Design an enzyme around this catalytic site. Structure first.
Site, PDB file in Angstrom:
ATOM      1  N   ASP D 341       0.916  -1.400  -0.026  1.00 43.45           N
ATOM      2  CA  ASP D 341       0.025  -0.015   0.213  1.00 43.45           C
ATOM      3  C   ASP D 341       0.937   1.253   0.161  1.00 43.45           C
ATOM      4  OD1 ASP D 341      -2.511  -1.321   0.124  1.00 43.45           O
ATOM      5  OD2 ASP D 341      -2.316  -1.500   2.258  1.00 43.45           O
ATOM      6  N   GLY D 342       1.927   1.196  -0.604  1.00 43.16           N
ATOM      7  CA  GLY D 342       2.873   2.393  -0.823  1.00 43.16           C
ATOM      8  C   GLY D 342       4.367   1.919  -0.382  1.00 43.16           C
ATOM      9  N   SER D 366       2.353   6.997   0.058  1.00 38.38           N
ATOM     10  CA  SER D 366       1.503   6.224   1.101  1.00 38.38           C
ATOM     11  C   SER D 366      -0.039   6.269   0.570  1.00 38.38           C
ATOM     12  CB  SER D 366       1.430   6.916   2.409  1.00 38.38           C
ATOM     13  OG  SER D 366       0.907   6.148   3.655  1.00 38.38           O
ATOM     14  N   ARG D 367      -0.562   5.313  -0.092  1.00 37.89           N
ATOM     15  CA  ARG D 367      -1.877   5.300  -0.459  1.00 37.89           C
ATOM     16  C   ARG D 367      -2.897   5.539   0.197  1.00 37.89           C
ATOM     17  NH1 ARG D 367       1.105   1.322  -4.107  1.00 37.89           N
ATOM     18  NH2 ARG D 367       0.024   1.285  -6.229  1.00 37.89           N
ATOM     19  N   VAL D 368      -2.589   5.429   1.619  1.00 42.56           N
ATOM     20  CA  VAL D 368      -3.709   5.965   2.558  1.00 42.56           C
ATOM     21  C   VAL D 368      -3.544   7.395   2.728  1.00 42.56           C
ATOM     22  CG1 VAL D 368      -4.241   3.405   3.286  1.00 42.56           C
ATOM     23  CG2 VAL D 368      -2.519   4.885   4.533  1.00 42.56           C
TER      24      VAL D 368
END
Ligand SMILES: Nc1ncnc2c1ncn2[C@@H]1O[C@H](COP(=O)(O)OP(=O)(O)OP(=O)(O)O)[C@@H](O)[C@H]1O
Ligand SMILES: Nc1ncnc2c1ncn2[C@@H]1O[C@H](COP(=O)(O)OP(=O)(O)O)[C@@H](O)[C@H]1O
Ligand SMILES: [Mg+2]
Ligand SMILES: [Mg+2]
Lengths: 466, 39, 35, 487, 67
Positions: D341-342, D366-368
């Protein structure tokens, strides 16, 4: 148990035991040879057949020849009697000085020290070499590696380390020649004889030599590293001494493993290497370590195939070392010797809490200025030196002065360069590089820092050229 | 103390085993009876 | 294969970005004045 | 002792003997035993050799069984007896492992006695589905300025640490592990993070040094260290990540929050490649097996953030990947980049320019993102990220240099989020465009000393609220201007 | 149960050590003292069987008036 050879393909010999199949790693003796031919069991194939690996040449082996199982792995003589002697892969004296009269024999296949035996002390080991002591300092009891392609100075650097550290040492030393020139082994033997390190008249010898060279079949080149390991392991455990273990070259171990793996019936991995490269390298390297029963300061020369540092063998051996001294050909072409790559050599004791804030700051500043010069290299090469700012010009000038100062004449090179060998203490290194970084020598020419000892000698050479 | 307590105890654990192998056909009878209890 | 100096991303691409965007930042803060 | 070695270490030993189904070793070589028999052995079942060894039954061929050996195949001979266990590979899970160093099967290697574990757990379990999960909202605090500000990590996220050799990946993981000390001994229970460190293919003295670093900072009372070092068999280095992940899934399934570091996954991929080449399975690219992407994805899919109907647990994974000469386009690096996720990209060029940690903020992702940050750190970090971008395209420019020198951090010095946000405040609000960069770190050292010595109430309000309120912003303005006058 | 009794007998027989405190070591004393020596150089060199001595240092000072 008595078996009969049923296949011979190069170094790999299949034996078929009618009773009592020998375990893996056992040492078998072939009957009817002029000398001793030992086969090391490697696999069980079923049908009461084993697949061994010969430690010597296999010419003249007939299908049906007799083979006896000894009942134990290859056992070499260990002790204080192996000091000043030379032994081959299977532990036989190859110096024409008679047998090795020891009281105990240790198998060359032992288990690595467990996790609870590891020691964590990281005191610095001063070598007398500028770039090594400054940027990638060694540690007493740590594992050191000298990477490098063909003809860049691995052997010269390891002989310099022997000159500076081995004879100035208190404990014992072990040199395991693994697949290198036999004339270099003769040179080392005679140099240690003349230097009193090896004494042929009494028992005051301080180095044990183990030699399986590049003229040896792949089995001997794969197990001679283990023979040296076993000698050093005895000197560490059963004596508690502080041992020095020099290995040159440790890449030949992996290369011989690949050569024999070709014939052992295994699907090859990348670049045609054995599938068991990292596991064999680990089972060998985890024995070369300092425990809480004794220390082993290991310096290993590591050949790099085709100058490719991403080759599976060096890329796998990086993760086993406490301090890496990566040599470079691009730097060696500039006459800078040793050719240590400053922006690629590392050390786990390059830590302010360990070496001191002064030393750490000098090292990091040198590395930062060299990285800045490296970033400028492109524009410098295309658009010429003029298009740089004067700040960039000052960075380039200081970086070139630092590059020249990292060079050093070696005491072992007194025969092919003429210049006296300089041994620079750590304080002189830190002081000279701090001064060069501060700009205290922006008036001296860069050729005044080339191949000198301390910074005072650079100043004197600058005065002499004018 | 913990150093002496460790090695002396592992030497102890080694003494007993190479001593019992030094030290009886009721086992072969006991093995036959214990085998019938498997069912 | 035009624009390759910027596609590579070496020294001559980073300085291209720097030169171009400093020029255009100057022009942008000057054009915000005329408005 | 004097009697306590027989009293129950012998009298209680379960010396029963039973009729067990067995097989017979046809051949043995390079840790791959071909067993004839075992007609009822299951796939991926753990079997046991007559010499105390253990092995997993991987290949179920019609005429034999390919048993990979968890140990040294020197002790195994042809015609040996392989006895079944009846159970798929499982490890001991529990809270007792906290503070222990174990190997890939859960056995203590620190010499402190057996683990008092009551329950066991498979290693090849299935990750939670779509329903049991919920959004990743809670922040996982690393204590590193560059990470916690520009590449924030949530609880339940899979953040990849990727770089070349000797660039600072293990140091990032160690800082992240040490930082959780403030939350673990504190009062708020749902801020406690029990770290897990899996050492795969590393040198044994490196893991010893690491355990020493983690016990010097008293960070071992909540850390499990699974270690399959270089001398351990390839199946052990292949099984270590799954064992560690099950040890963390124990916490994740029981309302607690865990963190697991795979250091690293390149060596697990290498061990799996060896183990599968020796089973005569056809090789793929770089001789890796065909299903190595599956090998890593079924592992990194178990790091989840459960909802409240399942306890609200969590498991954050930090896989590590080593690249060869900065080649991020290789096989295994691209696999794990596609999974996670990153990323946190480290470079040696930035590392030697004094930028340590050498986190490439341009490539780090950081995909979140903001969903995994406190409000105050978000308020300052938005503007900090934008200003750092603007500086990176024109490399204002002095403010950007000040910010980069602000991002630099020492080793084993994980700051708090309150102190981090105060520093990046003092950096972005303008009070540092007056100093010369060669004294920036000096200023921050002295400023942190002064603030933690005198202004614990402001930092307490920061830690309580999570927002830099106008009251807090004004008081912090006061403090920074007065100290800047003092400096 | 030849092995039930043996493991309890031979250990009870090992209690026949009051004469030899190391359960008839019969060797390893030659290397046992090396272990404590390695352990001693880890803790220093002083005889750890008695109380530690002391020498307490004093700060370095000057005259700080208006020169
Ligand atoms: N934040 C930092 N500040 C200063 N020095 C650092 C920092 N991080 C790492 N280092 C140093 O740079 C070196 C890198 O060590 P580290 O183990 O963290 O990198 P790595 O990715 O694990 O490389 P490898 O596993 O191949 O050894 C170490 O000597 C370490 O002391
Ligand atoms: N430190 C040095 N000083 C001077 N010359 C050197 C030095 N190192 C290497 N050389 C030169 O480069 C050559 C390579 O020597 P060598 O150490 O045998 O390389 P390698 O062992 O890696 O093949 C030497 O013949 C020597 O002339
Ligand atoms: Mg050479
Ligand atoms: Mg690491």
């Amino acid at each position: 148990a008595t078996g009969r050879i049923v296949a011979v393909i190069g170094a790999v010999v299949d034996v078929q035991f009618d009773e009592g199949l020998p375990p893996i790693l056992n040492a078998l003796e072939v009957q009817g040879r002029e000398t001793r031919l030992v086969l090391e069991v490697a696999q069980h194939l079923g049908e009461s057949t084993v697949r061994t690996i010969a430690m010597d040449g296999t010419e003249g082996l007939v299908r049906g020849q007799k083979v006896l199982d000894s009942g134990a792995p290859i056992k070499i003589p260990v002790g204080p009697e192996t000091l000043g002697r030379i032994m081959n892969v299977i532990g036989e004296p190859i110096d024409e000085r008679g047998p090795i009269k020891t009281k105990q024999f240790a198998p060359i296949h032992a288990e690595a020290p467990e996790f609870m035996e590891m020691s964590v002390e990281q005191e610095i080991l001063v070598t007398g070499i500028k770039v090594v002591d400054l940027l990638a300092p060694y540690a007493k009891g740590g594992k050191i590696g000298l990477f490098g392609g063909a003809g860049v100075g691995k052997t010269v650097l390891i002989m310099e380390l022997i000159n500076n550290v081995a004879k100035a040492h208190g404990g014992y030393s072990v040199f395991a020649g693994v697949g290198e020139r036999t004339r270099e082994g003769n040179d080392l033997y005679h140099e240690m004889i003349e230097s009193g390190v090896i004494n042929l008249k009494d028992a005051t010898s301080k180095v044990a030599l183990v030699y399986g060279q590049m003229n040896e079949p792949p089995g001997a080149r794969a197990r001679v590293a283990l023979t040296g390991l076993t000698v050093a392991e005895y000197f560490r455990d059963q004596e508690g001494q502080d041992v020095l273990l020099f290995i040159d070259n440790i890449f030949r171990f992996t290369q011989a493993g690949s050569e024999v793996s070709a014939l052992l019936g295994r699907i090859p991995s990348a670049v045609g290497y054995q599938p068991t490269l990292a596991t064999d390298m680990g089972t060998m390297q985890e024995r070369i370590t300092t425990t809480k029963k004794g220390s082993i300061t290991s310096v290993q020369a590591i050949y790099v195939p085709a100058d490719d540092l991403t080759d599976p063998a060096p890329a796998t051996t990086f993760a086993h070392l406490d301090a890496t001294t990566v040599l470079s050909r691009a730097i060696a072409e500039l006459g800078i010797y040793p050719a240590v790559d400053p922006l690629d050599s590392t050390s786990r004791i390059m830590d302010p809490n360990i070496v001191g804030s002064e030393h750490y700051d000098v090292a990091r500043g040198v590395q930062k200025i060299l990285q800045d010069y490296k970033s400028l290299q492109d524009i410098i090469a295309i658009l010429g030196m003029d298009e740089l700012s004067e700040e960039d010009k000052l960075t380039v000038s200081r970086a070139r002065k630092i590059q020249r100062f990292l060079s050093q004449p070696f005491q072992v090179a007194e025969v092919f360069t003429g210049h006296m060998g300089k041994l620079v203490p750590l304080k002189e290194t830190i002081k000279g590089f701090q001064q060069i970084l501060a700009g205290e020598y922006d008036h001296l020419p860069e050729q005044a820092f080339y191949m000198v000892g301390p910074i005072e000698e650079a100043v004197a050479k600058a005065d002499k050229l004018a | 103390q913990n150093m002496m307590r460790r090695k002396e105890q592992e030497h102890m654990i080694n003494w007993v085993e190479k001593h019992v192998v030094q030290s009886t056909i009721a086992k072969c009878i006991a093995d036959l009876k214990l085998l019938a209890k498997k069912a | 294969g035009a624009g390759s100096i910027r596609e590579a991303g070496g020294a001559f691409g980073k300085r291209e970005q720097a030169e171009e965007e400093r020029y255009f930042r100057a022009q942008s803060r000057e054009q915000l004045a005329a408005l | 002792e004097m009697s306590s070695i027989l009293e129950e270490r012998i009298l209680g030993a379960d010396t029963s003997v039973d009729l067990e189904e067995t097989g017979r070793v046809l051949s043995i070589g390079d840790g791959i035993a071909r067993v004839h028999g075992l007609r009822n052995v299951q796939a991926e079942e753990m079997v046991e050799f007559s010499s105390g060894l253990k092995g997993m039954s991987l290949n179920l061929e019609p005429d034999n069984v390919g048993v990979v050996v968890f140990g040294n195949d020197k002790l195994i001979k042809e015609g040996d007896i392989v006895k079944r266990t009846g159970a798929i590979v499982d490890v001991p899970v529990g809270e007792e492992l906290l503070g222990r160093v174990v190997d890939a099967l859960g056995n203590a290697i620190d010499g402190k006695g057996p683990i008092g574990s009551k329950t066991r757990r498979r290693v090849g379990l299935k990750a939670p589905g779509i329903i049991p999960r919920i959004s990743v909202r809670e922040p996982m605090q690393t204590g590193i300025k560059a990470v916690d500000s520009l590449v924030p990590i949530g609880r339940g996220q899979r953040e990849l640490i990727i770089g070349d050799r000797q660039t600072g990946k293990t140091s990032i993981a160690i800082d992240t592990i040490i930082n959780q000390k403030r939350f673990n001994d504190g009062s708020d229970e749902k801020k406690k993070l029990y770290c897990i460190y899996v050492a795969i293919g590393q040198k044994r003295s490196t893991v010893a040094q690491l355990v020493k670093r983690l016990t010097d900072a008293d960070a071992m009372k909540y850390t499990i260290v699974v270690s399959a070092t270089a001398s351990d068999a390839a199946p052990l280095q292949y099984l270590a990540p799954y064992s560690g992940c099950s040890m963390g899934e124990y916490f994740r399934d029981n309302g607690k929050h865990a963190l697991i570091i795979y250091d690293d996954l390149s060596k697990q991929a290498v061990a799996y490649r060896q183990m599968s080449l020796l089973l005569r399975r056809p090789p793929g690219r770089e001789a890796y097996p065909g299903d190595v992407f599956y090998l890593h994805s079924r592992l990194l899919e178990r790091a989840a953030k459960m909802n409240d109907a399942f306890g609200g647990g969590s498991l954050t994974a930090l896989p590590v990947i080593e690249t060869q000469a900065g080649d991020v386009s290789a096989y295994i690096p691209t696999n794990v980049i596609s999974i996670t996720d990153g990323q946190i990209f480290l470079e040696t060029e930035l590392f030697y320019k004094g930028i340590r940690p050498a986190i490439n903020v341009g490539l780090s992702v950081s995909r979140v993102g903001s969903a995994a940050q406190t409000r105050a750190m978000k308020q300052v970090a938005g503007t900090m990220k934008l200003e750092l971008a603007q500086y990176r395209e024109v490399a204002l420019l002095s403010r950007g240099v000040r910010l980069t020198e602000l991002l630099k951090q020492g080793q084993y010095s994980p700051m708090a989020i309150e102190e981090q946000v105060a520093v990046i405040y003092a950096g972005v609000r303008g009070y540092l465009d007056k100093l010369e960069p060669s004294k920036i770190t000096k200023f921050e050292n002295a400023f942190l000393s002064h603030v933690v010595s005198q202004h614990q109430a402001l930092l307490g309000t920061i830690r309580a609220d999570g927002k830099i309120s106008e009251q807090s912003d004004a008081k912090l303005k006061e403090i920074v201007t007065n100290f800047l006058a003092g400096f | 149960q030849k092995l039930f009794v043996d493991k309890i007998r031979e250990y009870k027989s090992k209690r026949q050590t009051s004469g030899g405190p190391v359960d008839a070591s019969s060797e390893y004393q030659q290397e046992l003292e090396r272990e404590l020596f390695k352990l001693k150089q880890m803790f220093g060199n002083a005889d750890m069987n008695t109380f530690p001595t002391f020498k307490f240092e004093d700060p370095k000072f000057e005259v700080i008036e208006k020169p």
